[PDB]
Design a protein around this ligand. Structure first.
Ligand code: ADP
Lengths: 529, 1238
DNA sequence: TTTTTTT
């Protein structure tokens, strides 16, 4: 019945691939099944009650444990997707379950396993009958509400419902330079159509309605009201996760007690995974920075709670992991080390009263109000503030400078920003730590940079480079109120990082709040650097 | 047939050989086309050159014509003997064809078939670059080209500005003396052509779409006043294009910063949107026409931030003659340099940049080098064979020449501090001193060689062994490839001479090894560890193998000093980090071992017993997945072979094949055995054959592969991986390799506690009885060599350094009350912050050889050649914002594959190095993703490249069939044949019916390879001469790896490297904006590294392992598995010694007592946990679960796994790897009950 | 049942 295909590292199972995603294996592609078909008793539980109290609060009081990914027939169950494939030699297009395709496999060397077209005789049927290699189709249909399905070739090639049952062909449209032109040809009705008609606004006239399929759960919904979309195979906008995390502290919001513990005059040292040092402060940054704390033993846990398909999460758009309300959710833990930086209160309170800061805050609030009303949400809520944007920009610049100077890998370092000001206990600080247990600098390589002779270097070299962007004139002139954007003066070329590291997902960013740019000057926080 | 007049309008001599340049537009020269003969005369009417046209390029005022066949007329021939007229107004003119045909043999004595062809490869490497550049950037046809049947957006890949990225700019610094500058901008524009003016049809008669190109551009003049730059439009016909920027205030030096931009401001129309785009832009800045001095551009500001470093200041000192003048914002820059190297005259932007790197050599062959090196080369003073026969006084006379000229060079370099090092006098003196130090050590080495006689004997022995191995390796290689040669051919002076820095390193390393009482090895402070650095390709490996040979030879002549044996045992330990690297190093070391054995065997026959009776051997110590761990497995592999103990494929001494099932013998093993490997010579003339070596103590090839056979009879040399050294805390029989032995068995060898044999045997199978004998111990080894030292950093280098505490301790021995320590030699390609690294891992003082000098180009041993005299390796950059990576990769691969065929069809076999193409990839997932695109889309686009109506000028038709993927999935049997698969060239014969070269393949022949792909390392086994073209996917994670990887191509032929850089990644874009400066100053940019042991996170993992490793091997009571539970008060006093040595090294390395207190507390904690468990009664306490007593035995330590990490978990490898999870497929058929609907 | 590459 079952057969192995391949293997991956288990750190990916909560960030890339996982339930409902398309795994691009070297020979084919699969979709991971839901967690209700997983081996419950081969998943080692992980103990963290503080994260459990929030997971229960979001997904209901029936959740029991947080469990690790499992470890000859033991593994992660998958199922092939998409089901329509194309033969290379003859160009024939047929679904797998019609019988014309058969599988060649080895149960001891399962990396070589791939599909072949059984008894190929060529396009004209003159070649000898031999198995020939085949390639999966390169187009899919996506829905906003969460549904995924194969491309409807039969509906598209005949312009509607049809009677014909003949074979289909694929072509490269003759010319070499063209990737935009592709042809689908019917062998029996002799009709043809182009793949260019399914994109742009032309897709609304031609493409049919959504069906409501969940490939990982193997179910069909009754009805769907969303307009479908044509999407390439392996696109970046196909799967986004929903994650929640917390830190292990000695002993109701998650971030509250962490800020309480980290700002104590004497940090505790009795817990086995908590040890801190108090190494100085650079001489150029005396008035701004009040305390730098280096952490040499730190522990973090994570969780996976759901996913969405086309757009990033802001909850009607979340897709469940099981048919019922699930009893357990996956988990992951990493032992690492971090650096904490605290800023001066009075310098921030004085800087908030300048006029240009109020102008930029009004512009960003207008852009936020424009952005929330386009999706029928309440526009009078969820503004983090202007201090959040300032700290969030400084964090991204520092993380980029870490990779530019020391030669680190990009996805090795995560971030965490403390900026609440509404509960009478104002917060100001960022936290930078390692992402995985096998990344760069895990053996004391990050606490090395926490000395006063290196952190000031890093900050100066970060602030000097950010003065001119590579698309500078139109970048500084960008107005978030006109186009309902949630960012200003921060494009891909000067601010943003990989999707693993960011906490909010590349929102609320403004480099003019830090240093004087070409159009805002008086709104800066660091002067003369 | 056209006429022309020579004027020499170009400077590049290689191009002026093969090209002709004519002024004016090509519209005045439209009648000249391809395949037309031309004739060139000078300004006085003398016939000079004849050529055949290959290709025509054109510009706004000049045209460039290329050739493929050319002949030069040497004689002074007047035009007046020919009936042809003088060329009027220096223009073209038609020549009579029949008169030309009659005149060619009559006066020039040549015919059409007598014209030769161009053979240079630097011309081909330029033609290929032009062919790719025309397709990727444009314009393909010319200034007024036409584009048929396709949109103009997708025809080109790079260099286009969209209407409302849309802008480009650059930054530069200007002098404060001038006040006006000049700015020039140019671009291109395309316009739709109406139907009634063009007659291009489809196949069915319909009209096609045709666009036409029109040039633009204009100049402005700009005064410098502080403030923003006023908007200006260079061209009146397009008033919505802008140049803008800002001008800043003065600095402390008195210069100004100027920032520029070029912005497209056009609007988007509803139809024909491609008319609003701007194509092929560029900017040029120059001084004004009436200005006094042209050079006004100066150095970009340093931007100091209060930091000092002697190495950084020295690096700024050496690279002072290459200056960065500008930076780019989205486009690379290029600057022209005046007669003063600090001043620049023009700056301009370049969409795709190119730069060529100078090559490094060892001097002695050219006429312009120093007289002493040429005298040494010409007089044969570098010959290895000659140096072993001279007397002591001619030997010192020959060796003094290497030091006298070095002292003269040091004296010459001292005068230039005041003149040519202004601003850097202190660093100049600091660099001057170390050359005098090196000269002092060279004279010390010569003095040591003068007084001692054992050193002289060892020196002669090493010279002879190196010469013999050097000569015989080439004969073995030639014999393995089926060549019919004899040994007489390879005995020449050319193949048996030194290179000067190898001999200098040998003379450096002599005094520390000849006498153990030297101050280098007997005191803990100021001990030198010799770091050797050089460009890749110089003989570093042959340099330290000679040191290993000298170390081996001298040890047997010193006698048994200090109550230790010296006639046998391990001497040299060599270690690596890559398992494959050890496999190619072993094959190199075996030839030297064989040569030493052959010398020793001949020495004993004559009656000279100085070398001893024990033979020289060599072993491999790598993981059990490669080598058998027990002789039963060695028997089982051979038994399964006839119906792995063989790492050798061919005999190192004669090159004969090896049959695994016949040439391997395993002796029967009641308790232990020996494995032998014999040469495959059936006729029986090799010295390692079965008919000759049966009498020797170690018959056959002297190699040891099995772990137990190594443990019972230790070898002279060991080649191992670093990760195998972590197994000391698991197995206690490793102590034999460090010389902790007391007993020996006549039948089997050295013994350890817990072994099978006890030394007492009765008579059995006719063999006599024997009894256990006692023996004095053996001296620990002398020399440790660590290669690829730059890879020893980060998390790997931390655990290499932490586990080096025990290794540095266990080779110590006492001589006359002092403590003797081993010499450490390291080798690397780069150097950056080496002092802290070497002090951290090795705890030594560093010494770098050779020193810098006052220049990058010139020191005494390395000479950097000029582009005029020797070619270099050209780099080229490609980048496009917003484009997907596969869309770039397909276009690049197709362009290169198709242009290579076009160069093949006209030239022939010299196009071979660019014919196969090598690709480097950063990740396995991207390699697998590209593998499917290479089979399907690249082949399709390569097969359809000249059967559409779109004109592609320089590409040609090729078929792509053979793709290989060189990675970790290949068995080692075909890997030498895969390397020999790449040796076959593209066979081609001239087809006279078509007039071109075509590859015809015979019946069942071996086809060549078209595309080969590579993972993070290349195959790096041999220096195959064929490969000369390479493409890199993205910038690698380190600078040293980048210099290493792209240096593997173009070693015997001109090379070409092309880097595809993304736009989203920070490092790729940052390297794109500074492409020209980064590739001119390589060593300035090596990224920082750190080695931090005794940090808490390393102490939770490695501390218990290092403590147990030190405790087990040094004592006898704790050696075996039953050693646990013997910890009691009478034996507790020997653990404090190990705790104290760990704490002493921690305190010395960290140089901070705050680390030492923590280390002491953590060691005391582990000691008191050990003391609790050993005192538990009613059980047998052991290290592991093993033996018949396992039903009552409880283990003490654990292996890493599913459980949580604790104090007693001991790792089994240096690097931590997280185990993966597998996927299970559920193949089944699915029915559908739901239907589509509108 | 132990040794290592690679994101
Ligand atoms: N004494 C010598 N004479 C001539 N060529 C030499 C000599 N020593 C080394 N070589 C050349 O050096 C090459 C090997 O260089 P190698 O020592 O492997 O460089 P690396 O520093 O990377 O180890 C060989 O191809 C060989 O031709």
């Amino acid at each position: 019945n079952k057969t192995p295909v391949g293997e991956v590292r288990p750190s990916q199972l909560l960030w890339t691939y996982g339930p409902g995603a398309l795994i691009d294996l070297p020979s084919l592609s699969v979709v991971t099944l839901g967690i209700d078909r997983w081996e419950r008793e081969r998943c080692q539980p992980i103990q963290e009650a503080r994260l459990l109290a929030a997971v229960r609060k979001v997904l209901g009081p029936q959740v029991e444990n947080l469990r690790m990914p499992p470890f000859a027939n033991i593994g992660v169950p998958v199922r092939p997707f998409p089901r329509w494939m194309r033969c290379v030699k003859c160009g024939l297009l047929s679904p797998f379950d019609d019988g014309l395709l058969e599988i060649k496999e080895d149960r001891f060397r399962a990396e070589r396993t791939r599909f072949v077209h059984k008894g190929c005789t060529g396009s004209k049927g003159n070649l000898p009958a031999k198995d020939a290699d085949a390639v999966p189709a390169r187009f899919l249909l996506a829905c906003r509400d969460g549904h995924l399905d194969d491309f409807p070739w039969h509906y598209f090639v005949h312009g509607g419902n049809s009677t014909c049952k003949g074979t289909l062909r694929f072509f490269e449209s003759g010319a070499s330079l063209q990737t935009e032109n592709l042809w689908v040809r019917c062998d029996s009705c002799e009709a043809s159509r182009s793949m260019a008609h399914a994109f742009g606004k032309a897709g609304k006239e031609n493409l049919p309605a959504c069906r409501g399929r969940h490939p990982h759960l193997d179910q069909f919904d009754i009805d769907c009201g969303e307009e479908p979309r044509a999407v390439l195979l392996g696109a970046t906008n196909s799967w986004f996760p929903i994650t929640l995390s917390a830190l292990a502290i000695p002993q109701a919001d998650i971030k509250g007690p962490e800020w309480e513990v980290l700002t104590e005059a004497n940090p505790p040292t009795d817990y086995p995974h908590f040890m801190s040092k108090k190494i100085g402060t650079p001489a150029q940054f005396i008035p701004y920075i009040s305390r730098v704390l280096l952490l040499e033993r730190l522990r973090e846990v994570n969780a996976l709670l759901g996913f969405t398909r086309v757009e990033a999460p802001e909850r009607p758009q979340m897709a469940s992991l099981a048919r019922n309300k699930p009893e357990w959710v996956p988990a992951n833990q990493v032992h690492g080390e971090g650096i904490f930086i605290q800023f001066n209160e009075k310098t921030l309170v004085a800087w908030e009263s300048l006029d240009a800061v109020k102008q930029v805050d009004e512009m960003l609030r207008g852009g936020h109000t424009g952005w929330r009303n386009s999706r029928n949400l309440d526009p009078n809520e969820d503004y983090p503030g202007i201090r959040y944007a300032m700290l969030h920009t400084l964090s991204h610049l520092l993380i980029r400078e870490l990779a530019l100077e020391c030669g680190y890998n990009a996805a090795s370092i995560r971030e965490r920003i403390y900026a609440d000001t509404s509960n009478g206990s104002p917060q100001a600080g960022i936290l930078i730590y390692t992402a995985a247990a096998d990344s760069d600098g895990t053996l004391g390589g990050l606490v090395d940079l926490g000395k006063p002779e290196n952190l000031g270097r890093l900050l100066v070299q970060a602030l000097n480079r950010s003065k001119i962007c590579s698309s500078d004139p139109l970048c500084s002139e960008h107005n978030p109120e006109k186009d309902r954007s949630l960012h200003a003066a921060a494009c891909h070329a000067c601010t943003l990082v990989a999707e693993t590291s960011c906490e909010q997902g590349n929102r609320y960013l403004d480099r003019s709040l830090l240093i004087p740019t070409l159009e805002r000057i008086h709104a800066a926080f660091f002067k003369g650097f | 047939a056209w006429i022309a007049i020579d004027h020499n309008f170009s400077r590049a001599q290689v191009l002026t050989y093969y090209t002709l340049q004519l002024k004016g537009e090509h519209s005045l020269h439209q009648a000249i086309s391809d395949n037309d003969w031309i004739l060139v005369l000078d300004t006085t009417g003398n016939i000079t050159r004849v050529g055949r046209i290959l290709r025509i390029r054109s510009d706004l005022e000049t045209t460039t014509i290329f050739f493929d066949r050319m002949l030069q007329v040497k004689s002074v021939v007047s035009i007046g003997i020919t009936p042809f007229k003088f060329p009027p107004n220096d223009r073209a003119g038609r020549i009579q064809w029949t008169d030309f045909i009659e005149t060619l043999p009559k006066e020039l004595h040549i015919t059409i078939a007598d014209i030769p062809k161009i053979e240079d490869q630097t011309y081909i490497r330029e033609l290929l670059q032009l062919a790719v550049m025309d397709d990727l950037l444009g314009p393909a046809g010319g200034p007024n080209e036409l584009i048929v049947d396709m949109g103009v957006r997708d025809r080109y890949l790079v260099g286009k500005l969209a209407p409302r990225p849309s802008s480009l700019g650059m930054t530069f610094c200007v002098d404060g003396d001038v006040d006006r500058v000049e700015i020039e901008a140019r671009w291109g524009r395309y316009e739709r052509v109406p139907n009634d003016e063009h007659q291009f049809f489809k196949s069915n008669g319909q009209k096609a779409k045709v666009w036409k190109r029109i040039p633009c551009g204009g100049k402005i003049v700009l005064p410098l006043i502080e403030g923003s730059i006023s908007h200006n439009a260079p061209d009146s016909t397009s008033p919505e294009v802008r140049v803008q920027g800002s001008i800043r205030a003065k600095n402390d030096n008195g210069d100004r910063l100027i920032t520029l931009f070029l912005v497209n401001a056009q609007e988007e129309p509803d139809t024909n949107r491609d008319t609003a785009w701007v194509f092929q832009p560029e900017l040029i800045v120059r001084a004004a026409k009436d200005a006094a001095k042209p050079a006004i551009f100066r150095r970009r500001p340093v931007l100091d931030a209060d930091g000092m470093d002697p190495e950084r200041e020295a690096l700024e000192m050496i690279y002072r003659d290459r200056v960065e003048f500008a930076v780019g914002h989205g486009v690379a820059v290029h600057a022209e340099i005046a007669d003063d190297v600090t001043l620049a005259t023009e700056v301009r932007t370049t969409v795709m940049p190119q730069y060529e790197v100078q090559a490094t050599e060892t001097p002695g062959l050219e006429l312009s080098d120093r007289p002493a090196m040429r005298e040494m080369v010409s007089s044969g003073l570098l010959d290895m064979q000659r140096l072993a026969t001279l007397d002591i006084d001619p030997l010192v006379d020959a060796l003094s020449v290497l030091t006298n000229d070095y002292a003269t060079w040091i004296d010459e370099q001292n005068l230039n501090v005041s003149s040519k090092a202004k601003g850097f006098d202190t660093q100049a003196q600091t660099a001057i001193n170390r050359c005098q130090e090196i000269h002092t050590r060279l004279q010390e080495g010569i003095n040591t060689l003068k007084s001692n006689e054992n050193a002289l004997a060892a020196f002669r022995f090493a010279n002879q062994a190196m010469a013999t191995q050097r000569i015989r390796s080439l004969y073995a290689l030639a014999m393995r490839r089926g060549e019919d040669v004899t040994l007489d051919k390879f005995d020449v002076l050319k193949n048996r001479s030194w290179r000067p820095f190898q001999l200098a390193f040998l003379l450096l390393s002599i005094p520390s090894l000849a006498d153990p009482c030297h101050p280098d090895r007997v005191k803990p402070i100021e001990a030198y560890a010799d770091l050797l650095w050089f460009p890749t390709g110089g003989g570093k490996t042959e340099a330290y193998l000679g040191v290993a040979a000298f170390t081996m030879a001298i040890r047997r002549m010193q006698g048994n000093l200090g109550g230790y044996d010296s006639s046998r045992g391990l001497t040299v330990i060599m270690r690596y980090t890559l398992r494959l690297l050890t496999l190619q190093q072993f094959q190199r070391a075996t030839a030297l071992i064989c040569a030493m054995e052959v010398l020793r065997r001949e020495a004993l026959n004559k009656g000279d017993k100085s070398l001893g009776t024990e033979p020289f051997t060599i072993g491999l110590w790598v993981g059990n997945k490669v080598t058998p761990g027990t002789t039963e497995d060695s028997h089982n592999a051979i038994e399964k072979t006839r119906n792995s103990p063989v790492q050798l494929t061919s005999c190192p001494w004669c090159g004969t094949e090896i049959v695994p099932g016949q040439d391997v013998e395993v002796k029967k093993d009641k308790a232990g055995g020996r494995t032998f490997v014999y040469c495959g010579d059936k006729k029986g003339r090799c010295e390692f054959s079965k008919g000759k070596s049966s009498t020797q103590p170690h018959p056959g090839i002297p190699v040891l592969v099995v772990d137990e056979e190594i443990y019972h009879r230790p070898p002279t040399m060991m080649i191992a991986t670093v990760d195998k050294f972590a197994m000391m805390a698991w197995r206690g029989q490793v102590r034999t390799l460090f010389g902790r032995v007391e007993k020996e068995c006549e039948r089997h060898g050295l013994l350890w506690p817990g072994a099978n044999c006890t030394g007492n045997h009765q008579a059995f199978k006719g063999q006599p009885s024997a009894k256990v004998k006692a023996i004095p111990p053996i001296r620990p080894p002398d020399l440790i060599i660590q290669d690829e030292f730059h890879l020893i950093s980060g998390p790997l280098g931390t655990m290499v350094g932490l586990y080096e505490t025990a290794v540095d301790e266990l080779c110590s021995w006492t001589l006359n009350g002092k403590t003797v320590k081993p010499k450490i030699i390291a080798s690397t390609a780069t150097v950056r912050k080496a002092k802290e690294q070497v002090n951290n891992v090795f705890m030594r003082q560093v010494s770098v050889f050779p020193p810098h000098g006052l220049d990058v180009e010139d020191n005494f041993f390395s000479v950097q050649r000029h582009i005029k005299d020797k070619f270099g390796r050209r780099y080229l950059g490609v980048c496009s914002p917003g484009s997907s990576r596969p869309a770039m990769l397909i276009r690049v691969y197709t362009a290169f594959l198709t242009a290579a065929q076009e160069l093949f069809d006209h030239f022939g076999e010299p196009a071979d190095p660019y014919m196969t193409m090598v690709g480097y990839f950063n990740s396995l997932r991207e390699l697998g993703g590209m593998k499917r695109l290479a089979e399907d889309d690249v082949q399709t686009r390569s097969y359809r490249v000249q059967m559409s109506m779109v004109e592609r000028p320089a590409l040609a038709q090729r078929s792509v069939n053979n793709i290989r993927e060189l990675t970790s999935r290949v068995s080692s049997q075909d890997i030498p044949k895969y390397l020999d698969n790449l040796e076959v060239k593209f066979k081609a014969e001239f087809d006279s019916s078509a007039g071109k070269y075509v590859t015809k393949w015979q019946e069942g022949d071996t086809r060549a390879i078209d595309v080969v792909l590579a993972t993070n390392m290349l195959s790096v086994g041999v220096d195959v001469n064929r490969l000369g073209l390479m493409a890199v996917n993205g910038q690698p994670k380190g600078t040293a790896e980048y210099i290493q990887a792209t240096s593997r191509v173009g070693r015997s032929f001109p090379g070409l490297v092309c880097t595809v850089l993304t736009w989203a990644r920070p490092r790729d874009l940052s390297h794109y904006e500074t492409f020209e400066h980064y590739h001119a100053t390589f060593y300035k940019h090596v990224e920082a590294q750190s080695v931090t042991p005794f940090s808490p996170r390393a102490m939770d993992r490695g501390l218990t392992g290092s403590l147990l490793s030190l405790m087990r091997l040094k004592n006898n009571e704790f050696s075996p598995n039953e050693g646990a539970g013997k910890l009691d008060m009478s034996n507790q006093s020997e653990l404090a010694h190990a705790i104290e040595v760990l704490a002493t090294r921690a305190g010395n390395v960290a140089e901070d007592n705050a680390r030492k207190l923590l280390a002491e507390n953590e060691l005391k904690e582990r000691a008191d946990e050990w003391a609790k468990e050993a005192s538990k009664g009613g059980r047998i306490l052991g290290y592991e679960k093993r033996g018949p007593d396992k039903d009552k035995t409880v283990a003490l330590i654990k292996s890493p796994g599913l459980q949580a990490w604790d104090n007693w978990t001991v790792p089994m490898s240096m690097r931590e790897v997280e185990s993966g999870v597998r996927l299970i497929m559920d193949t089944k058929f699915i029915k559908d009950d739901h239907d589509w609907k509108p």
